[PDB]
Design a protein around this ligand. Structure first.
Ligand SMILES: [Ca+2]
Length: 123
């Protein structure tokens, strides 16, 4: 499923401030990383990242590609490729707790300016 900005804003409203991250910053982050697509798959050399939150099999979920993964979110990675982002959010919260926003942004200055652009203005 490909969400719109305003759709995700409604779904994610309650996570605003979690780990000290503002909603617009998170929406910005998701745009850059998955384009708001629940089915996004990015394959790297030694790991794959899945879904809206681009959750990696290296540490976070169980996949046959990386048998030794710690599987911190205690879930099969296929769960991050469906249309229900509930479990995705559960795992993203763990990521925010442990790694923070730099899991996604890697210490780059992305999503630091004009954050109001990421708000839903339509309703
Ligand atoms: Ca899911």
């Amino acid at each position: 499923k490909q969400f719109t900005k305003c759709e995700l804003s409604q779904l994610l409203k309650d996570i605003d401030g979690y780990g000290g991250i503002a909603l617009p910053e998170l929406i910005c982050t998701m745009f850059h990383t998955s384009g708001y697509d629940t089915q996004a798959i990015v394959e790297n050399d030694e790991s794959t990242e899945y879904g809206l939150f681009q959750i990696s099999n290296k540490l976070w979920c169980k996949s046959s590609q990386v048998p030794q993964s710690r599987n911190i979110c205690d879930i099969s990675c296929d769960k991050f490729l469906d249309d229900d982002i509930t479990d995705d959010i559960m795992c993203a919260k763990k990521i925010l707790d442990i790694k923070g926003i730099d899991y996604w942004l890697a210490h780059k200055a992305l999503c630091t300016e004009k954050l109001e652009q990421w708000l839903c203005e339509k309703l």
